[PDB]
Amino acid sequence: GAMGSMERASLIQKAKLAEQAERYEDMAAFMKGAVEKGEELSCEERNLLSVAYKNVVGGQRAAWRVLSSIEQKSNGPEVREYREKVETELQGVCDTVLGLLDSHLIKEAGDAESRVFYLKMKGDYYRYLAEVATGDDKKRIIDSARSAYQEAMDISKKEMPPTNPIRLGLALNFSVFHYEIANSPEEAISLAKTTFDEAMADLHTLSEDSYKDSTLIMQLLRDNLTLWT
């Protein structure tokens, strides 16, 4: 790792500076270096890791979608080659994240909160791989995302209240998986609705701060349901 010579605390600090500078590729590299120090991550550190790579892969996905649409309208080799270039870099980022989860974030995560967070991430990055996959690896990728998401759901329902923001975001993303990847829009709609209603009924238990956290994600569930019905 090019970050192996930097102190863990300095890597975290620089990840926070990169975030403020909207330098998400740097941020992700700093957080990768932090993970590779081998210690567990705190909640804030998990959020830093997730924000960094979500932004990196998000830009790659947006670019891939633009190029894929151009490629589709066109059907020279240039559009395909350049789509393939972006696709390969995107898969590389996903493989990097999944590698971090497998070596060794998931196995070392004892607390429910951390294990759910990382299994959700594993579902997310297999989902991003599935978006660009074509073939027999596609089915295996899709089922792998589902298994990670469902294991995270089972833990979150045992160990977290229905308003917990990681539980809510897991459900939000798994719902999107059902709708856009698994061709299961009724499953997606049922999951977002049940998640929303269960959280609504639990809001009475929350402080003002927790209420803010939970209703932010509940709004995204409602935003998707409005789009889907």
């Binding site: 975001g169 993303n173 856009e180 995204l220 935003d223 789009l227 889907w228």
Partner: peptide, 5 residues
């Protein structure tokens, strides 16, 4: 395109 977090 739908929201994810």
């Amino acid at each position: 395109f739908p929201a994810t977090v």
